[PDB]
C-alpha cells in the first residue's frame, strides 16, 4: 500500500543524500546500559497521577 511504501522509501531516502550535521547528530544515541541507567533514575522522579 501507498502508506507502507512511503514510510519505507522515506527511510531509504534518509539513508541516501548527504544529511546536514545538525540533523545527523540525532542518529547518535546513548547505548543500552546508559539508557537503562537514565530511565532508572527517571522512574524515581515521575509526575503525580490523577489519584495522587
Amino acid at each position: 500500500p501507498e502508506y507502507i511504501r512511503l514510510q519505507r522509501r522515506r527511510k531509504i531516502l534518509n539513508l541516501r543524500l548527504k544529511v546536514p550535521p545538525a540533523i545527523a547528530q540525532f542518529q547518535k544515541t546513548l547505548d543500552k546500559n546508559t539508557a537503562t541507567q537514565v530511565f532508572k533514575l527517571l522512574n524515581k522522579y515521575r509526575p503525580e497521577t490523577a489519584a495522587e
Binding site: 501507498e2 511504501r5 512511503l6 522509501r9 522515506r10 531516502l13 534518509n14 543524500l17 544529511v19 546536514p20 545538525a22 540533523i23
Partner: protein, 200 residues
C-alpha cells in the same frame, strides 16, 4: 520558549538544514494526495500565530497547488474581439495560489470553516500550503469565546468571499491613499451614482 527559536529558524530558508528538510518533505507530499489531512502541523509556531490551537475542533489540511500563470481557457487562442483582449499566454489570476488552496480545502471540508493557511513548501510545479480549519459544530469551539465568532452564519465560506487574510490581501483591502480603490464595487458605485436631491 521554543516558539521564538522556531520562528527565527524558519526565516533561514536558504540554510542546509532547511534545504534538506524542504527537499525530503516536498518528496513526501508529492507521494501523498493533492489534498490530505495532516495529523499535526509541520510548523506549530506558524499555526499558533495564525490562530491554531492544539485542542479538539482544529483541523490541519495540506494541499498542493499548481504554479504559474492562468492561460485563457479559449479553444484555440481565439478571443473574437479587439487586439487588446487577444492575450492568451501571459495572463495572471487575480487571486493567489494561497487563496485557491483555501477554497479547495474549504470545498473538501464543507462542514468546517477555513480559519487561515500558510506556505510550507514549494517546487517548480507545486506550492504546498497547510490550511487551518475550525469545526463550528464542536462543543469545544462553541463554548470558547475567543473562537465563538466563527460559528455565526455570517462567516460561512469566508475564504470564498475573500474574508481571510490572503483573501483581503487579494481584494486590496487596506488603509491609506495606496488603497483608494477600496472595495472596488462599493467605491465604483459611490463614484458613479448620480444623486438627484429634492431641491426643495
Amino acid at each position: 520558549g521554543a516558539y521564538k527559536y522556531l520562528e527565527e529558524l524558519a526565516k533561514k530558508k536558504q540554510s542546509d538544514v532547511n534545504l534538506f528538510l524542504s527537499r525530503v518533505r516536498a518528496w513526501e507530499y508529492r507521494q501523498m494526495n493533492v489534498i490530505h489531512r495532516a495529523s499535526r502541523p509541520s510548523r506549530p509556531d506558524k499555526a499558533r500565530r495564525l490562530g491554531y490551537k492544539a485542542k479538539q475542533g482544529y483541523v490541519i489540511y495540506r494541499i498542493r497547488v499548481r504554479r504559474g500563470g492562468r492561460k485563457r481557457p479559449v479553444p484555440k487562442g481565439q478571443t473574437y474581439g479587439k487586439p487588446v483582449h487577444q492575450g492568451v499566454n501571459h495572463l495572471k489570476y487575480q487571486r493567489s495560489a494561497r487563496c485557491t488552496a483555501e477554497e479547495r480545502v474549504g470545498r473538501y471540508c464543507s462542514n468546517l470553516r477555513v480559519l487561515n493557511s500558510y506556505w510550507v513548501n514549494q517546487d517548480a510545479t507545486y506550492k504546498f500550503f497547510e490550511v487551518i480549519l475550525v469545526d463550528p459544530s464542536h462543543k469545544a469551539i462553541r463554548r470558547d469565546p475567543r473562537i465563538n465568532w466563527i460559528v455565526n452564519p455570517v462567516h460561512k465560506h469566508r475564504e470564498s468571499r475573500g474574508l481571510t487574510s490572503i483573501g483581503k490581501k487579494s481584494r486590496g483591502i487596506g488603509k491609506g491613499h495606496r488603497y483608494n480603490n477600496s472595495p472596488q464595487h462599493a467605491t465604483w458605485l459611490r463614484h458613479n451614482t448620480l444623486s438627484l436631491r429634492r431641491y426643495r
